[PDB]
Amino acid sequence: QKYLGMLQNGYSDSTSAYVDNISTGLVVNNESKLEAYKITRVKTDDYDKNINYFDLMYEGNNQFFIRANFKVSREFGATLRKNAGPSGIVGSLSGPLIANTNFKSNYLSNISDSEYKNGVKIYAYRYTSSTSATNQGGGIFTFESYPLTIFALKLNKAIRLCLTSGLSPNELQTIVRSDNAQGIINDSVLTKVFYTLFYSHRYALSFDDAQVLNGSVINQYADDDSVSHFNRLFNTPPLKGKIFEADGNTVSIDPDEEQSTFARSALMRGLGVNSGELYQLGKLAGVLDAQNT
């Protein structure tokens, strides 16, 4: 289940569908081909409060949402994708949204096949009053689909590599994602795996830290009983809220700025540096932008 998630075989109506992945074989209905897909979720801020589950379901060329709630509310919800942007609406859940009840969402539309790979399908802009709405949580959803034989071959590759090297399925997935979009295994990926093992043995680092050292991004996948590396760095414990990469906006790391930002403070605390050292790191890495942002 670490590799495959939960197979869709007609369970009960709610039952969730993520362990924290979902997959099944589905015969495409526009022609006579049988494919297999897989959707992986990274939970997004304020998900453990409200939302029993928030699942992205795939039906062959179009996707919808299945949602359950912790608390009862008498109003509706809008599933957005942007930070309350004009073009952020991608679907709606019609209420009243009672707790512990399944709710389907109307064949989400405003999302492209390009962003369906590493694209946030989620924004639970749920209405608590007639004019008050809040972000009640969600997750970033990544979708892959292959013919069944190609899926089996890729699973063969991944399982053999994980078994022989000792890396976790999610660690290998992050390594291959930080190397190419197609998630193929080549000399570059094998070299990164070697350097991961070597750095872990040499500097007495965890596999996540060695993976970051090798050139990969910080891992955000959680295993439904553990904490992701990003969350362990930046949200254990949270300052007062959750800092997430699902922000995409510009924060100024100029030390000389009056009225600093919560994002800057959380980044400083996660990296274990002060404002001047964070400015030094920004200059050294060259991630700096205009206005020292």
């Binding site: 939960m6 039952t15 512990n100």
Partner: protein, 196 residues
């Protein structure tokens, strides 16, 4: 049934394993019973167990495990089987604690026999298909009454009009495995790992 079982239990407590085996073979023997120079066709040598004869019609009038097993003498079959497994595991541990090569081989033999009598242990089946309900949804008197009416009708008849029960209307809890048997399997796994 009750006298050979008590004699077996006392001999096992005193560690007279061969005599205990002789006394428990009057009730159950995995190798059968020799009657008139041939293997008998019955599995259990205790006739009331072989025929599952209930002789207690009011078992729940008091908290009494023996009364329950008298109402359903299947539990007596399970109890005798578990007593036999306990005897085998005690024999294996007693052989193991001698540390000689022949003693270790004897321990391996006893553990393998216990494993072959137990079989292959099952997995968790219904946990991930369970839809977690609300507290009020689980305590729903309507759900409880529907299940109880189905049970009452099943206790006499078997009418299954609209056979499938429309799984979406389940807020009931699921049966649980036996911790004693899982403990047997865990012990055997640990002992075989250490021996190997």
């Amino acid at each position: 049934y009750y006298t050979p079982m008590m004699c077996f239990q006392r001999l096992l407590q005193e560690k007279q394993f061969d005599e205990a085996t002789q006394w428990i073979n009057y009730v159950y023997n995995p190798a059968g019973y020799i009657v008139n120079g041939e293997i008998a066709p019955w599995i259990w040598n205790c006739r009331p167990l072989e025929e599952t004869t209930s002789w207690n019609a009011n078992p729940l009038d008091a908290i009494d495990p023996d009364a329950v097993a008298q109402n359903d003498p299947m539990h007596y079959k399970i109890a005798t089987f578990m007593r036999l497994l306990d005897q085998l595991i005690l024999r294996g541990d007693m052989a193991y604690r001698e540390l000689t090569r022949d003693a270790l081989n004897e321990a391996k033999m006893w553990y393998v026999r216990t494993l072959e009598l137990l079989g292959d242990e099952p997995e968790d089946y219904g946990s991930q298909q369970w839809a977690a309900p609300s507290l009020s949804g689980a305590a729903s008197q309507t759900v409880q009454a529907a299940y109880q009416q189905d049970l009452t009708m099943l206790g006499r008849g078997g009418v299954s009009k609209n056979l499938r029960t429309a799984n979406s209307l389940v807020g009931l809890f699921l049966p649980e495995y036996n911790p004693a048997l899982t403990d047997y399997w865990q012990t055997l796994r640990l002992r075989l790992f250490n021996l190997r």
